[PDB]
XYZ file of C-alpha atoms in Angstrom:
493
model
C 23.541 22.209 -11.959
C 22.782 19.695 -9.217
C 23.390 16.759 -11.568
C 26.710 18.311 -12.593
C 27.652 18.613 -8.917
C 26.719 14.969 -8.293
C 28.771 13.824 -11.285
C 31.686 15.912 -9.996
C 31.567 14.607 -6.417
C 31.398 10.922 -7.368
C 27.812 10.106 -8.270
C 26.679 6.663 -7.121
C 29.372 5.458 -4.736
C 29.666 3.773 -1.347
C 27.493 6.409 0.339
C 24.584 5.915 -2.064
C 25.155 2.145 -2.049
C 24.689 1.989 1.719
C 21.906 4.586 1.827
C 19.551 2.976 -0.696
C 19.479 -0.390 1.076
C 19.444 1.050 4.599
C 16.421 3.132 3.572
C 14.469 0.521 1.562
C 14.902 -2.291 4.114
C 11.564 -1.714 5.968
C 9.468 -2.071 2.816
C 9.915 -5.825 3.254
C 7.746 -5.523 6.382
C 5.550 -2.892 4.697
C 3.463 -5.566 2.960
C 3.320 -7.671 6.127
C 1.934 -4.743 8.122
C -0.514 -3.985 5.304
C -1.856 -7.554 5.061
C -1.551 -8.754 8.689
C -5.299 -8.306 9.269
C -6.176 -11.245 7.012
C -3.998 -13.583 9.110
C -4.656 -12.152 12.581
C -8.439 -12.024 12.033
C -9.101 -15.309 10.233
C -12.512 -16.712 11.159
C -12.626 -20.385 12.204
C -15.573 -22.753 12.312
C -17.819 -22.237 15.329
C -21.237 -23.125 16.710
C -23.465 -22.213 19.636
C -22.298 -23.409 23.036
C -24.407 -26.128 24.657
C -26.198 -24.839 27.757
C -24.600 -25.273 31.167
C -27.458 -27.641 32.081
C -28.102 -32.569 19.931
C -28.613 -28.913 20.883
C -27.806 -27.404 17.458
C -29.750 -27.212 14.176
C -28.252 -28.488 10.940
C -28.565 -27.197 7.377
C -28.590 -28.818 3.936
C -24.792 -29.116 4.003
C -25.149 -30.996 7.305
C -22.830 -28.774 9.332
C -24.229 -27.375 12.599
C -25.507 -23.817 12.403
C -23.182 -21.125 13.734
C -25.931 -18.819 15.051
C -28.733 -21.137 16.187
C -29.364 -23.717 18.896
C -32.073 -25.997 20.264
C -34.199 -25.242 23.315
C -35.730 -28.648 24.162
C -34.164 -32.069 24.777
C -34.372 -34.769 22.126
C -38.681 -27.813 17.847
C -38.463 -24.095 18.530
C -35.110 -22.343 18.816
C -33.642 -19.318 20.585
C -30.626 -17.148 19.721
C -27.155 -17.951 20.992
C -26.531 -16.360 24.395
C -24.108 -18.389 26.522
C -21.096 -18.245 24.209
C -19.335 -20.002 21.365
C -17.064 -23.017 20.906
C -14.302 -22.625 18.324
C -12.101 -25.139 16.512
C -8.384 -25.179 17.318
C -7.347 -27.335 14.335
C -5.469 -24.743 12.256
C -5.903 -21.366 13.996
C -5.354 -21.715 17.771
C -6.419 -18.137 18.546
C -7.300 -14.953 16.659
C -9.102 -11.722 17.497
C -12.373 -13.367 16.433
C -11.875 -16.103 19.026
C -10.678 -13.590 21.625
C -13.577 -11.127 21.346
C -16.446 -13.237 19.899
C -16.786 -11.108 16.757
C -19.360 -13.332 15.067
C -23.036 -13.070 14.131
C -24.245 -9.846 15.752
C -20.841 -8.111 15.675
C -19.598 -9.627 12.403
C -19.104 -6.116 10.979
C -16.388 -5.122 13.459
C -13.812 -7.207 11.580
C -14.297 -4.987 8.521
C -14.632 -1.848 10.652
C -11.134 -2.476 12.020
C -9.713 -2.593 8.488
C -11.608 0.569 7.530
C -10.320 2.486 10.551
C -6.796 1.254 9.821
C -7.068 2.436 6.210
C -8.217 5.872 7.370
C -4.857 6.132 9.118
C -2.793 5.754 5.946
C -4.621 8.645 4.258
C -4.455 10.912 7.306
C -0.769 10.118 7.760
C 0.061 10.916 4.152
C -1.811 14.223 4.400
C -0.279 15.392 7.686
C 3.245 14.059 7.207
C 3.657 15.540 3.731
C 3.370 19.010 5.246
C 5.414 17.952 8.274
C 8.253 16.787 6.014
C 8.040 19.889 3.817
C 8.362 22.046 6.937
C 10.928 20.167 9.064
C 13.010 18.146 6.618
C 13.093 14.429 5.907
C 15.308 12.769 8.535
C 13.394 13.987 11.595
C 9.999 12.956 10.233
C 11.480 9.601 9.203
C 12.823 8.815 12.680
C 9.628 10.053 14.344
C 7.533 7.803 12.094
C 9.909 4.912 12.814
C 9.430 5.286 16.570
C 5.672 5.793 16.219
C 5.331 2.612 14.153
C 7.408 0.665 16.672
C 5.480 1.850 19.735
C 2.046 1.500 18.128
C 2.777 -1.988 16.817
C 4.185 -3.163 20.142
C 1.245 -1.783 22.133
C -1.414 -3.017 19.685
C -0.776 -6.646 20.651
C -1.621 -5.753 24.273
C -5.152 -4.358 23.932
C -7.821 -5.446 26.438
C -10.453 -3.449 24.510
C -11.517 -3.284 20.880
C -11.339 0.558 20.898
C -7.750 0.325 22.158
C -6.829 -2.144 19.423
C -8.510 -0.055 16.718
C -6.864 3.195 17.845
C -3.432 1.567 17.931
C -4.017 0.133 14.452
C -4.978 3.573 13.124
C -1.828 5.114 14.612
C 0.247 2.327 13.054
C -1.311 3.029 9.660
C -0.545 6.737 10.033
C 3.108 6.041 10.791
C 3.420 3.459 7.994
C 2.100 5.964 5.458
C 4.627 8.474 6.751
C 7.593 6.115 6.490
C 6.624 4.951 2.992
C 6.193 8.470 1.607
C 9.369 9.801 3.226
C 11.402 6.803 2.038
C 10.272 7.353 -1.549
C 10.916 11.103 -1.385
C 14.380 10.774 0.170
C 15.487 8.091 -2.287
C 14.319 10.172 -5.256
C 16.000 13.289 -3.849
C 19.365 11.614 -3.263
C 19.378 9.774 -6.579
C 20.288 11.689 -9.774
C 17.533 12.685 -12.175
C 18.192 10.102 -14.889
C 18.305 7.250 -12.332
C 14.652 7.218 -11.275
C 13.005 4.409 -13.249
C 15.573 2.007 -11.791
C 14.704 3.140 -8.256
C 10.993 2.740 -8.975
C 11.537 -0.789 -10.288
C 13.610 -1.575 -7.150
C 10.764 -0.193 -4.946
C 8.130 -2.302 -6.775
C 10.296 -5.455 -6.523
C 10.908 -5.018 -2.748
C 7.177 -4.442 -2.171
C 6.391 -7.582 -4.179
C 9.014 -9.645 -2.340
C 7.716 -8.721 1.125
C 4.736 -11.072 0.749
C 6.880 -14.218 0.891
C 8.406 -13.049 4.176
C 4.895 -12.332 5.456
C 3.754 -15.867 4.621
C 6.854 -17.427 6.168
C 6.582 -15.530 9.441
C 2.837 -16.232 9.573
C 3.478 -19.964 9.277
C 6.239 -19.719 11.883
C 3.995 -17.987 14.441
C 0.298 -18.957 14.283
C -0.778 -17.099 17.425
C -1.983 -13.583 16.660
C -0.465 -11.783 19.665
C 3.007 -13.219 19.104
C 2.729 -12.704 15.337
C 1.906 -9.022 15.836
C 4.721 -8.594 18.357
C 7.295 -10.277 16.110
C 6.151 -8.274 13.079
C 6.436 -4.957 14.927
C 9.644 -5.781 16.840
C 12.282 -5.072 14.124
C 11.124 -1.462 13.765
C 12.808 -0.741 17.108
C 16.250 -1.730 15.810
C 15.395 0.087 12.583
C 14.743 3.250 14.608
C 17.990 2.631 16.495
C 19.986 2.650 13.259
C 17.894 5.490 11.774
C 20.054 8.027 13.642
C 22.852 7.620 11.044
C 21.136 9.419 8.165
C 22.118 12.526 6.197
C 19.545 15.129 5.188
C 18.889 15.580 1.478
C 20.650 18.480 -0.223
C 17.648 19.706 -2.239
C 15.535 20.657 0.777
C 18.518 22.259 2.511
C 19.242 24.371 -0.572
C 15.574 25.334 -0.950
C 15.266 26.259 2.745
C 17.649 29.212 2.386
C 20.619 27.686 4.242
C 23.765 26.975 2.219
C 26.481 26.113 4.756
C 24.650 22.968 5.881
C 24.151 21.874 2.268
C 27.828 22.407 1.449
C 28.920 20.552 4.594
C 26.659 17.614 3.723
C 27.950 17.536 0.138
C 31.569 17.653 1.317
C 30.941 14.829 3.792
C 29.253 12.722 1.101
C 32.138 13.325 -1.308
C 34.801 12.503 1.286
C 33.099 9.292 2.438
C 32.645 7.913 -1.097
C 36.352 8.072 -1.931
C 36.837 11.237 -3.999
C 39.146 12.966 -1.533
C 40.452 15.085 -4.433
C 37.150 16.159 -6.000
C 35.475 16.803 -2.641
C 38.026 19.494 -1.781
C 37.157 21.664 -4.807
C 33.729 22.752 -3.531
C 33.506 26.399 -2.487
C 30.906 28.807 -1.146
C 31.045 31.021 -4.241
C 31.311 28.158 -6.749
C 28.169 26.529 -5.356
C 26.502 29.949 -5.195
C 27.132 30.494 -8.910
C 26.095 26.924 -9.742
C 22.772 27.180 -7.869
C 21.145 30.056 -9.738
C 18.176 28.233 -11.321
C 16.887 26.150 -8.399
C 16.846 29.153 -6.052
C 14.768 31.199 -8.507
C -1.700 24.369 -6.658
C -5.177 22.844 -6.865
C -6.536 26.109 -8.316
C -5.444 25.225 -11.853
C -6.042 21.519 -11.208
C -9.796 22.114 -10.859
C -10.974 25.551 -11.974
C -9.264 26.242 -15.293
C -10.766 24.171 -18.134
C -7.334 22.940 -19.223
C -6.826 20.223 -16.580
C -10.392 19.144 -15.717
C -10.802 16.642 -18.555
C -7.567 14.890 -17.526
C -7.923 15.106 -13.739
C -11.385 13.525 -13.780
C -10.263 10.510 -15.813
C -7.020 10.036 -13.873
C -8.820 10.171 -10.522
C -11.422 7.692 -11.766
C -8.743 5.270 -12.971
C -6.715 5.484 -9.752
C -9.768 5.004 -7.535
C -11.075 2.082 -9.594
C -7.691 0.338 -9.604
C -7.211 0.626 -5.843
C -10.838 -0.313 -5.131
C -10.535 -3.455 -7.250
C -7.112 -4.440 -5.890
C -7.175 -3.876 -2.125
C -10.375 -5.882 -1.712
C -9.277 -8.601 -4.110
C -6.142 -9.170 -2.030
C -7.966 -9.995 1.225
C -10.041 -12.997 0.129
C -7.691 -15.972 0.516
C -9.849 -18.019 2.898
C -12.816 -18.564 0.578
C -11.007 -20.213 -2.344
C -10.673 -23.622 -0.693
C -6.935 -24.331 -0.729
C -4.704 -23.539 2.252
C -4.288 -19.815 2.826
C -0.501 -20.193 3.070
C -0.284 -21.711 -0.415
C -2.709 -19.088 -1.725
C -0.575 -16.274 -0.279
C 2.560 -17.831 -1.783
C 0.939 -18.017 -5.230
C -0.345 -14.439 -4.951
C 3.155 -13.230 -4.101
C 4.830 -15.319 -6.806
C 2.662 -14.548 -9.837
C 3.225 -10.757 -9.890
C 6.688 -10.665 -11.466
C 5.980 -12.178 -14.933
C 2.774 -10.142 -15.213
C 4.643 -6.883 -14.637
C 7.414 -7.946 -17.035
C 4.982 -8.688 -19.862
C 3.079 -5.492 -19.068
C 6.286 -3.486 -19.400
C 6.984 -5.183 -22.730
C 3.464 -4.495 -24.021
C 3.426 -0.825 -23.008
C 6.897 -0.242 -24.469
C 6.189 -2.005 -27.776
C 2.595 -0.810 -28.334
C 0.450 2.145 -27.342
C -0.389 2.811 -23.717
C -4.182 3.007 -24.041
C -4.629 -0.523 -25.519
C -2.548 -1.954 -22.674
C -4.524 0.002 -20.074
C -7.915 -1.025 -21.449
C -6.826 -4.646 -21.918
C -5.565 -4.912 -18.338
C -8.651 -3.270 -16.831
C -11.124 -5.291 -18.904
C -9.292 -8.572 -18.281
C -9.245 -7.975 -14.521
C -12.939 -7.090 -14.515
C -13.911 -10.091 -16.639
C -11.857 -12.452 -14.470
C -13.460 -11.141 -11.275
C -16.951 -11.358 -12.786
C -16.344 -14.936 -13.937
C -15.004 -15.847 -10.492
C -18.154 -14.422 -8.923
C -20.468 -16.219 -11.347
C -18.717 -19.610 -11.235
C -19.626 -21.926 -8.323
C -17.084 -22.265 -5.526
C -16.955 -26.082 -5.538
C -13.996 -26.243 -7.950
C -10.841 -24.407 -6.869
C -8.458 -25.503 -9.650
C -10.018 -22.945 -12.016
C -11.486 -20.322 -9.671
C -8.178 -19.854 -7.849
C -6.271 -19.587 -11.134
C -8.719 -16.999 -12.484
C -8.435 -14.945 -9.290
C -4.634 -15.100 -9.514
C -4.731 -13.966 -13.148
C -6.961 -11.050 -12.182
C -4.575 -10.069 -9.392
C -1.629 -10.153 -11.789
C -3.496 -8.026 -14.323
C -4.339 -5.474 -11.623
C -0.702 -5.420 -10.498
C 0.405 -4.683 -14.066
C -2.259 -1.986 -14.457
C -1.024 -0.270 -11.289
C 2.459 0.265 -12.738
C 1.001 1.200 -16.128
C -1.138 3.972 -14.633
C 1.761 5.065 -12.407
C 3.808 5.709 -15.538
C 0.914 7.211 -17.508
C -0.136 9.831 -14.946
C 3.334 11.352 -14.697
C 3.998 11.023 -18.422
C 0.757 12.871 -19.245
C 0.613 15.636 -16.631
C 2.628 18.747 -17.581
C 5.825 19.746 -15.793
C 4.126 22.343 -13.581
C 1.272 20.280 -12.086
C 2.972 16.867 -12.385
C 3.713 16.554 -8.660
C 0.232 17.770 -7.717
C -1.370 15.318 -10.134
C 0.646 12.408 -8.762
C -0.313 13.412 -5.224
C -4.007 13.625 -6.087
C -3.806 10.248 -7.816
C -2.282 8.711 -4.698
C -4.982 10.377 -2.587
C -7.749 8.928 -4.763
C -6.061 5.520 -4.596
C -6.079 5.696 -0.797
C -9.739 6.780 -0.837
C -10.566 3.735 -2.952
C -8.631 1.525 -0.549
C -10.694 3.019 2.284
C -14.052 2.422 0.605
C -13.274 -1.124 -0.610
C -13.845 -2.875 2.772
C -17.108 -0.953 3.173
C -18.287 -2.361 -0.159
C -17.129 -5.813 0.962
C -19.354 -5.288 4.016
C -22.501 -5.650 1.872
C -22.674 -9.443 1.932
C -25.838 -10.142 3.952
C -28.244 -8.939 1.252
C -26.684 -11.253 -1.352
C -23.608 -13.511 -1.145
C -22.506 -12.504 -4.662
C -22.984 -8.726 -4.308
C -19.368 -7.929 -3.256
C -17.820 -9.897 -6.122
C -20.376 -8.515 -8.581
C -19.557 -4.922 -7.614
C -15.818 -5.672 -7.643
C -16.101 -7.034 -11.178
C -18.486 -4.358 -12.419
C -16.487 -1.281 -11.361
C -13.424 -1.898 -13.612
C -15.672 -2.817 -16.554
C -17.118 0.698 -16.553
C -13.746 2.192 -15.590
C -11.947 0.788 -18.646
C -14.188 2.623 -21.131
C -12.903 5.998 -19.886
C -9.309 5.407 -21.047
C -10.188 6.060 -24.709
C -10.388 9.812 -24.054
C -6.765 9.835 -22.845
C -4.399 10.795 -25.698
C -1.411 8.576 -26.387
C 2.098 9.883 -25.775
C 4.291 7.007 -26.979
C 7.470 8.254 -28.624
C 6.502 11.910 -28.200
C 8.098 14.723 -26.180
C 6.604 15.541 -22.807
C 4.380 18.648 -22.712
C 5.753 21.672 -20.864
C 3.001 24.321 -20.863
C -0.775 23.986 -20.907
C -0.830 25.893 -24.215
C 1.290 23.210 -25.901
C -1.157 20.473 -24.889
C -4.003 22.556 -26.342
C -2.695 22.124 -29.894
C -2.556 18.332 -29.543
C -6.212 17.995 -28.538
C -7.233 20.422 -31.304
């Protein structure tokens, strides 16, 4: 037994203590690299440049129009041609100022985010197979270097295609590093110590936002902000050479001497110089007799369809509602730094109370309550006028907290419901649908010209219909996990 071997060699000692932190360190910058678009592409106030030879319309609010200008001295008007004048009050320079991505090309700002989010999905897909074929350490270091190079070269991009391609490569590598970090940590931790690691992961991810806000305030310029955000990955790659490959993959790959050498090294670096000397080729051979010995069932057989459909719908709806909700800090009214700080601070109590609710009551009432509350909050935010921020901002924050709680709730539910044979496949498909929702969310946010309230209305309407699906999901609180598809058949009967 692998757990028996881990308990014999020393379990969680100095080796694991160093490894967990040295592996989870970059997830602090994970959130920064995920959210950096909102701060490097903030749109400032602008208006049409006066001609090179009083020249600008005004609206009911009294501000000069940003896409119109006079044609006669002080009448008819002609579209802006010469250029644009921006305001350097709060944002000295962004990509919008650099490339004049306003009016006619206002969609390129969202197109950049969409092409970046394609990268995360493609990276997950490719690098899962790459890791399964060539181990975990090599793919980790390759993704480290790719992230470093892509992030460094993205700041120096004379052309929008160059910037977009570098962003897509960065997203690919970030997906790779995240997935491989999670897999390696799970593999090296014992079986019973997995919920603790997941909590740790969640916490780190939540705590990265404060660092993002601090560094963004420190460096307002977009080029320098990008460079400073992507710089530490080089030192991270430098230290990534001192990693040890996981024993599970080595055992499953048909090679035993490497696995035994790694186990002996781990035992002798933790401190158990007596226990680490008892490992033998034949003893390990006798111990490892059970471990040594797809989508077809996930879709075709009628036993998993009625669960896969609902789980995919829930994952997609959650990601679609969350990843577009996050990137709307400018429109509330208060300073975006304070808004980011509040968004990063409110998550912890929401997840705590969500954990309490799901552990004291059934899972379906918690799921439906979270989904419906998030949808209602978003709908009310869309309906309410934007003049008052004291209530609109608070409602948006409450919706974000509810969505954050629902994410963890569904993360637990999917694994706890899927049987032992398709559990990994179901989790992978759920993550894939989540990434698809994250991809489509900016494209829905694109549809703002037809109606100002259409994006918020759609964002608040999707979870409302999504929450009504959860009723069909059977509860599993205080019940043993299903093992075969036949066992689950009796429960639904």
